[PDB]
Amino acid sequence: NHHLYPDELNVSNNPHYRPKPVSYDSTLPPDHIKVYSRTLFIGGVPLNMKEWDLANVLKPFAEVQSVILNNSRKHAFVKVYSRHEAENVLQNFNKDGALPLRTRWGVGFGPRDCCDYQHGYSIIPMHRLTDADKKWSVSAQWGGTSGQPLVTGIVFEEPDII
RNA sequence: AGUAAU
Structure with missing residues (x-):
């Protein structure tokens, strides 16, 4: 969906x-x-970025399963296939701060x-x-x-x- | 600087 x-x-x-x-x-x-x-809160999302873009940026660090993107509220919700992958993304994605994307935890269940x-x-x-x-x-x-x-x-x- | 769809 x-x-x-x-x-x-x-x-x-x-x-x-x-x-x-x-x-x-x-x-x-x-x-x-x-x-x-396994769900990730991503914030500082630009207006130009679509769902495909976000997934493609995380691609090296994790394989993405699902992306609910609230473009108007400058954030998104990205489920990846495994906890190991999500955990990797949190430390190692965008260390330099080249992108504006802050990446924190998010709630998928319960x-x-x-x-x-x-x-x-x-x-x-x-x-x-x-x-x-x-x-x-x-x-x-x-x-x-x-x-x-x-x-x-x-x-x-x-x-x-x- | 934003935690939602259900």
């Missing part, structure tokens, strides 16, 4: 193939989960007040997910649990949605 490719699949032949790191965490409270964001914008994850109580969220969490193409059921402690990369 706002993806580059709508009906694409996370499979070994797709050059966008990624793993789905799942891990568990004993320091979480009961019936809470951890979610690492409540906003549950997100740590600084470190870039959400610790979410399972009751605050909707039926839809709980579905996508387990059956997402990129990110999610890759079939593993949701339980206390689980940690996984932000899933895709509708």
Whole structure:
């Protein structure tokens, strides 16, 4: 929809193939989960830049999945295929400051007040997910649990949605 | 200097 490719699949032949790191965490409270964001807040976006441009600038540092661009509000929302890639973009993209683009964290999944914008994850109580969220969490193409059921402690990369 | 679509 706002993806580059709508009906694409996370499979070994797709050059966008990624793993789905799942891990568990004993320091979480009961019936809470951890979610690492793959979504990026980009700000200082010029008027001349289209969606294609942004994706193409990040291309060396990360492969982009989806780009919602609010051109009038001089910012955008860029989901990349993996957490590793998003993390790379934050340190290493535009170090010199040649472009006007500031690149910070952004929230793709779960409540906003549950997100740590600084470190870039959400610790979410399972009751605050909707039926839809709980579905996508387990059956997402990129990110999610890759079939593993949701339980206390689980940690996984932000899933895709509708 | 802008954190949204749902």
